[PDB]
Amino acid sequence: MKSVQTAATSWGTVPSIRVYTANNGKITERCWDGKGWYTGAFNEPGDNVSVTSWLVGSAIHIRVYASTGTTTTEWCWDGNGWTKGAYTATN
Amino acid sequence: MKSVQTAATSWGTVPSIRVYTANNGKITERCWDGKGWYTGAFNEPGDNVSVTSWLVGSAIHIRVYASTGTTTTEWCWDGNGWTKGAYTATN
Amino acid sequence: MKSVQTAATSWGTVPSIRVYTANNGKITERCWDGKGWYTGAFNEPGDNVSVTSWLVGSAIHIRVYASTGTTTTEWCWDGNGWTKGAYTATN
Numbered sequence A, B, C: 001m002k003s004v005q006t007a008a009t010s011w012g013t014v015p016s017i018r019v020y021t022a023n024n025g026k027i028t029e030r031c032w033d034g035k036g037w038y039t040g041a042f043n044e045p046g047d048n049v050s051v052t053s054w055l056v057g058s059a060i061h062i063r064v065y066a067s068t069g070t071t072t073t074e075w076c077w078d079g080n081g082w083t084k085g086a087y088t089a090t091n
């Protein structure tokens, strides 16, 4: 049957986990920080999703790559809300 | 042509790598621990797969997200067998 | 609509980022090292891609898993060009 597509990242030792789900063209986010799953602020269009993150000290930085057709849009979390990133590709 | 879908994670100083393949609704696992590839114990249903892992000291923790329909099931490896995680996509 | 499929990895604190895109049977690579996106050296066939990476000091080691059909080919970056890895899906 048709199935959603996911991408996952984690950081630290607790850990913090973020799982992105692409469902019928919309990506949403589920979060774990040690006390139960909850819904994240990320909501962007996309059929397909990948993610990577890195720590600067204790500060997390997340990059989500959301693709519709041949266009991939990068979204960035740097502690102060999601912003559109500079990524481009000539697909 | 129709193609399988993979997810990969790695850790530590060997390094240890784990590659999950979703093929026709079934997910399986191939492992590298420095001495050749071999088949892992993970076998769970799923059309799509993502994975993340983290170390706590020397202990690996792996989380594999297996999706069928709109249901994503989280599978947990924490040193002693695969168990179903608490992940849900809604509350 | 049909959409491309991506995978992403990053390392260090700058950070460096690599984003792999599978598009109509071909996987290509875009790169960030703090100073703008550019096209990387990776070009290999595949309908689906996953990736994992690890540092050895400042030196990055990347493993890209490229799938066509039921055949997943591992590509290896160890500082000196992309080479085919030992991964096989069965014994």
Ligand SMILES: Cc1c(C)c2c3c4c1OP(=O)(O)Oc1c(C)c(C)c5c(c1C4)Cc1c(c(c(C)c(C)c1OP(=O)(O)O5)OP(=O)(O)O2)C3
Residues within 6 Å of the ligand: A001, A002, A003, B024, B025, B047
């Ligand atoms: C309950 C059910 C529904 C509502 C279906 C389908 C199936 C189905 O039975 P199920 O027990 O899941 O057996 C299947 C299993 C185990 C796999 C692995 C299948 C399919 C089926 C067959 C084929 C299938 C179907 C699809 C879609 C969109 C895809 C992508 C799709 O390919 P994919 O998931 O790779 O391969 O259509 P749709 O979801 O409307 O209908 C057809």
Ligand SMILES: Cc1c(C)c2c3c4c1OP(=O)(O)Oc1c(C)c(C)c5c(c1C4)Cc1c(c(c(C)c(C)c1OP(=O)(O)O5)OP(=O)(O)O2)C3
Residues within 6 Å of the ligand: B001, B002, B003, C024, C025, C047
């Ligand atoms: C040998 C072979 C088989 C057995 C096929 C197909 C093709 C095929 O020739 P190939 O040399 O691979 O040329 C193609 C290439 C290079 C690409 C990139 C293609 C397709 C083909 C055509 C289209 C195609 C086909 C599919 C399926 C399920 C998909 C998803 C699919 O899309 P996708 O992989 O994005 O695009 O059907 P199926 O596997 O039954 O049959 C049809």
Ligand SMILES: Cc1c(C)c2c3c4c1OP(=O)(O)Oc1c(C)c(C)c5c(c1C4)Cc1c(c(c(C)c(C)c1OP(=O)(O)O5)OP(=O)(O)O2)C3
Residues within 6 Å of the ligand: A024, A025, A047, C001, C002, C003
């Ligand atoms: C412009 C356009 C083209 C050229 C299409 C399709 C659609 C389409 O309109 P759009 O505004 O994108 O509305 C859709 C939206 C928003 C979603 C979420 C859709 C589809 C469509 C419909 C269905 C669809 C279509 C496909 C393919 C290959 C897939 C995988 C596919 O599933 P998926 O992306 O999950 O679901 O065929 P193809 O790209 O040839 O044709 C059909």
Ligand SMILES: OC[C@@]1(O)OC[C@@H](O)[C@@H](O)[C@@H]1O
Residues within 6 Å of the ligand: A018, A029, A031, A039, A040, A041, A042, A077
């Ligand atoms: O604390 C939750 C949160 O702020 O964590 C960082 C990002 O995952 C956000 O989308 C998410 O809402």
Ligand SMILES: OC[C@@]1(O)OC[C@@H](O)[C@@H](O)[C@@H]1O
Residues within 6 Å of the ligand: A063, A074, A076, A078, A084, A085, A086, A087, C017, C032
């Ligand atoms: O601060 C945001 C940014 O500079 O972070 C590094 C890369 O993800 C860039 O594409 C992105 O615009």
Ligand SMILES: OC[C@@]1(O)OC[C@@H](O)[C@@H](O)[C@@H]1O
Residues within 6 Å of the ligand: B018, B029, B031, B039, B040, B041, B042, B077
């Ligand atoms: O040594 C192999 C193994 O035990 O490693 C941890 C997990 O990847 C398991 O599924 C796998 O069988």
Ligand SMILES: OC[C@@]1(O)OC[C@@H](O)[C@@H](O)[C@@H]1O
Residues within 6 Å of the ligand: A017, A032, B063, B074, B076, B078, B084, B085, B086, B087
């Ligand atoms: O020990 C298992 C568990 O608590 O680990 C952290 C998260 O992956 C949870 O969903 C999961 O149930």
Ligand SMILES: OC[C@@]1(O)OC[C@@H](O)[C@@H](O)[C@@H]1O
Residues within 6 Å of the ligand: C018, C029, C031, C039, C040, C041, C042, C077
């Ligand atoms: O400096 C760019 C580069 O060498 O970085 C390592 C790999 O990502 C290569 O494919 C890529 O061309």
Ligand SMILES: OC[C@@]1(O)OC[C@@H](O)[C@@H](O)[C@@H]1O
Residues within 6 Å of the ligand: B017, B032, C063, C074, C076, C084, C085, C086, C087
């Ligand atoms: O050649 C490099 C290599 O040994 O690195 C470890 C694994 O990725 C192997 O499959 C691969 O062949």
Ligand SMILES: [Zn+2]
Residues within 6 Å of the ligand: A001, A002, A003, B025, B047, B068, B069
């Ligand atoms: Zn299915």
Ligand SMILES: [Zn+2]
Residues within 6 Å of the ligand: B001, B002, B003, C025, C047, C069
């Ligand atoms: Zn194909």
Ligand SMILES: [Zn+2]
Residues within 6 Å of the ligand: A025, A047, A069, C001, C002, C003
């Ligand atoms: Zn679409």
